[PDB]
Amino acid sequence: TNSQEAAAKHEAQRLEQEARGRLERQKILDQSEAEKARKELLELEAMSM
Amino acid sequence: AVESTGNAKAEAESRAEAARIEGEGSVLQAKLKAQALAIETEAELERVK
């Protein structure tokens, strides 16, 4: 039972790892387009200031 | 880059944009001062003469 538990544990841990890695990459991506819109806002803010 | 350089550029550009105005105003006021000294020293010249 300790063996099967170790298997399910390692598996769920690896899956959560790959998942958090995906969501992390999506975070960096969303930060990228947000950086784009922020850049345009910096342009309009530049001309306005 | 565009934000910071745009800000400093707009700021210094505002500085020069003002300085040219007080400069030209200094020119016209220099002209009025020239006329003032002109007629003043001229009328005063009759007195000393």
CB of A46 closer than 8 Å to CB of B2: yes
Cα B34–B40–B46 angle (5° rounding)? 135
- How many Cβ atoms from other residues are within 10 Å of residue B15's Cβ? 10
- B23: three-class secondary structure by DSSP: helix
What is the distance in angstroms between the Cα of A17 and the nearest Cα belonging to chain B?
36
Put simply, whether A39 touches B (Cβ < 8 Å) is: yes
Q: Which is nearest to B3 in space by CA: A33, A35, A45? A: A45
The technique is cryo-EM
- Decide if B7 and A39 are in contact by the 8 Å CB cutoff: no
